[PDB]
Symmetry: C2
Subunit: 431 residues, 2 copies
Amino acid sequence: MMEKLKEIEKVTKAIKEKILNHYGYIRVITHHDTDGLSSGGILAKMLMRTNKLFHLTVVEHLSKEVIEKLAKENEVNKPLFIFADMGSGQIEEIIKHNFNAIILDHHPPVIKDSFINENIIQLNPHIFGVDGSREITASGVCYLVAREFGYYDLSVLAIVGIIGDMQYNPLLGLNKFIVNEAREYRYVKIMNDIVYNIYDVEIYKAIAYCTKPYIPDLASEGKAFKFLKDIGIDPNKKQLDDTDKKKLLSAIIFKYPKIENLLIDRYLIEHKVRDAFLLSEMLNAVGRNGLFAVGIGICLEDDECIKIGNQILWEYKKNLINELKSVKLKKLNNIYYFEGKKGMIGIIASILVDDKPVIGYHIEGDIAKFSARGNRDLVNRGLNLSVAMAVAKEFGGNGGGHDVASGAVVSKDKVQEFLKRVDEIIGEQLR
Amino acid sequence: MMEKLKEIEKVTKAIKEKILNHYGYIRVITHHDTDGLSSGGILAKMLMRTNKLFHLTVVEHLSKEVIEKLAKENEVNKPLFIFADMGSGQIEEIIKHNFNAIILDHHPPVIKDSFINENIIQLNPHIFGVDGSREITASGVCYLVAREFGYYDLSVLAIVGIIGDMQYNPLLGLNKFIVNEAREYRYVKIMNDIVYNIYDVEIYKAIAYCTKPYIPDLASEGKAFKFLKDIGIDPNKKQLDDTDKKKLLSAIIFKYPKIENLLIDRYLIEHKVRDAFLLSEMLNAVGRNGLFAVGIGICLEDDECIKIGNQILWEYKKNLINELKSVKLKKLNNIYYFEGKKGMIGIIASILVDDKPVIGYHIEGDIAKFSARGNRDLVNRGLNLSVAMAVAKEFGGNGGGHDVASGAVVSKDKVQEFLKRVDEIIGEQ
Ligand SMILES: [Mn+2]
Ligand SMILES: [Mn+2]
């Protein structure tokens, strides 16, 4: 592991020198999810500290259209471009326009090279045989650059990206090294705890609006209040102690049996938002609402951006519970499915997964677009959603993805027939 | 005085709405002194809080060449330009290239209109009869916009700008409104104290490197250490109590009865750099060292930028003391002048100013850049260095600023252009 870092240091040192020796404009382009906003915040601090002024933009997708602007800014003052949480998938277009560019990304690379020509450096873990889907995120990649300047305090934002991208359980590889370094330097403390304690609000509200896990029977202030009163816990306290947690867990297993999902390693970070899980949810909610610059402000610990983030998070959480309660969940033999709204199908399907895969879809043109979600126990028993969603090219469509999460597209009149086929495939995968 | 705010608030509400309704790129341009960097920090926090991404650049002078650049950025994606601590004098060039712009400035305006055309809003307090040299700074103008959003916490950076532009004594007009609003919202507390206690270092170092007041007989660690041990004060302590204060005051006033400003009204602000006087000096030092992004970072309370800022401040103050010893004051008819190094010219001028204006300069390539300072005593008798230094037009350049402090540039005719300035200063006297 010290040897893999030694191979990565060759690329991070070159990136450091490229930034230090550049004196023109610097453009930072990052993504709007939690990992992208955290990357933006790491880069903003690192650049300010090295005396670089910069123009930071947050985009939703690095399309051909987006890259073809930007290239218009190249014509006079050819800036140094730093792409974060994107860039590897689109590297051909970036080479095409001859950007002076640094790419910090963990998406599977199209070109598996760290040095592309004389003007492009690509830092992507897959090039060193690190699995970017489980062992490092974009914010960790930006952090590997920052630590060449000795900015170990920025490790707290790398951890936020680890949570946002669901790479915290298990904690593997470079991610595990990053957390250990942060703990050694005392920027993070690690504490096993119950998930409701991360919110620092009234516990009955923490339970009412939780979606990790979502417990339908408890998903309202009234039912959560009553449940806590019954087992003798003060519903208005803001942290459950050890006695409260034993009583809660003993009682809740009857409404939600997989109570291991209620226990997590909490990360208490050196940041004004001290709970990394809470900061991750805040950045998500702010990014989903288009408040990109507020999200950067939160990473930079601005009081007012944090106050906006708190207000937006709880509106986001209340609205998500409302959306969840409006789902008309329909059951086949081995799956559930539902029709919902274009924006949140996959978000809703992942939250709804309990014992069987969940497939959501929305109708667009004549198209119908599906999002399929499973869990780890489902995969261990033999689920593979990309094989089952591939059957879309049997009904004049297309489908695929990962074993635990896949999509598909299939003409609007084949919905029932496509789902029957998917249901039967999954049934057989699990025997 | 509350009536003059009502007139300003019509321009700050229009600025607020112009920023809110803009969804393209935003360019912020400020200067590198304490007032410009503080304005950059105010605008950075204000813009982020209103969900605006932006590109900030710091220039030392808003030259015609700089304006022609920047203007090339309007060809595709026409940004909204926010000019802070600049733009009012250059207004005709900004109009000429048809920027979408907001101008936040306290220099004497060229056009005395708030609402120039369809595209430009100029917020300049001179237009409402506020004295931009004694009653408000660029920081305070930026803060007047920010308070339209309720961002009262940003008053701490306006206070830093007030100090950096030497408008804290006396504290007048809009600057006094801002300080009292800050104290009312509990973002500042005011405390009368000896100047040397603002540094939180060993007193013999706080004295040796102090330049307000500058005491040449004590401007070394050696003599400062000995002066304190001879009057009963432990020179290694970092804060002076009342007894050591009265002992140091009378000992200093005895041997130097002309000395002034040993007791100041300290401003303790809600900021990681709690002493606004120290924050002012720190921003000046990093700005003079070209560390523009670090200074913004310091305003935004980044721990590492503050660390750099402390290290750079003390290197700078030591460089400054060495240069005050070796500087060569020279007399003419009605000005003093000198040559020196880039980051020291304006500050040495104002430390030395006593009986007549001082103009420093440094040669940077083919050009000489000047810094003229008077006092409020000399503008009382009609100085205005902005009229005096504008005669660089006669020498292939330009000039301007405030009545009490101005600059000028070009070229190798320093001596010829110097004494065309001592001329005006007696026609003005
Ligand atoms: Mn990611
Ligand atoms: Mn100023």
